[PDB]
């Protein structure tokens, strides 16, 4: 397994998006993993529609702007046989009527792969060999809100009670000792302006910090 990975440097990640005031981080995380998988398969990077997901996956268990889950989203992409691009189905940040139009589909998944819960090495492994991995984390902390740079480590973080889905686009370390001060390169959906260009480095191999490895998964394309 490599010492560091950064899928953004390989063209698998779209520019940072903003979920605004709507609880769809789970949709952002889902579209991130999908955009990366579709890229690996076709060599084309296409921004996917989170709005598609907000409005149409209530049957799979999602709740549009009030929460949802990444695997439930992959689940919907599969039952539905498709997912529209952002350009054809724009994000408006509010629960609206499902207007999925298959002529505008640009992605597909036949299911998904899960990572054993709490297993950071399984996660590192999925990251290194597949591409960006959708993950859930506990982001209920002011320190996260105000995060600007470096490795984020918050003592009151939970590894069990999560409220936010993000995307692990890679991992690495700080310094020269590959085995220490490691972090997960995480893509957020609070705009380019939050954190470090919209990303956050989160303590790695520090007991499943903030639950990043608790319920990770990626779509099968």
């Amino acid at each position: 397994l490599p010492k560091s990975v950064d899928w953004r440097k390989k063209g698998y990640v779209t520019p940072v998006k903003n979920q605004k005031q709507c609880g769809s981080s789970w949709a952002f995380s889902a579209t991130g993993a999908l955009e990366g998988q579709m890229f690996r398969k076709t060599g084309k990077l296409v921004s996917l529609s989170e709005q598609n997901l907000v409005d149409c996956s209530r049957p799979q268990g999602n709740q549009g702007c009030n929460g949802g889950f990444m695997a439930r989203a992959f689940q919907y992409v599969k039952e539905n046989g498709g997912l529209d691009s952002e350009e054809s189905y724009p994000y408006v940040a509010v629960d609206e009527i499902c207007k999925y139009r298959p002529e505008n589909s640009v992605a597909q998944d036949t299911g998904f792969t899960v990572v054993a819960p709490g297993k950071e090495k399984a996660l590192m492994k999925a990251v290194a060999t597949v591409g960006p991995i959708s993950v859930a984390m506990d982001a209920g902390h002011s320190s996260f809100q105000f995060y600007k740079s470096g490795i984020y480590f918050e003592p009151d973080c939970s590894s069990k009670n999560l409220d936010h889905g993000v995307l692990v686009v890679g991992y690495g370390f700080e310094g020269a000792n590959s085995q220490n001060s490691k972090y997960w390169l995480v893509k957020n959906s609070w705009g380019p302006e939050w954190g470090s260009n919209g990303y956050v480095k989160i303590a790695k191999d520090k007991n499943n910090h903030c639950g990043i490895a608790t319920a990770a998964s990626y779509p099968n394309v």
């Binding site: 903003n18 979920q19 605004k20 709507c22 981080s25 209920g140 002011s142 809100q145 936010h164 609070w190």
Partner: peptide
Amino acid sequence: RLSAK
């Protein structure tokens, strides 16, 4: 969750 902002 949503940004505090």
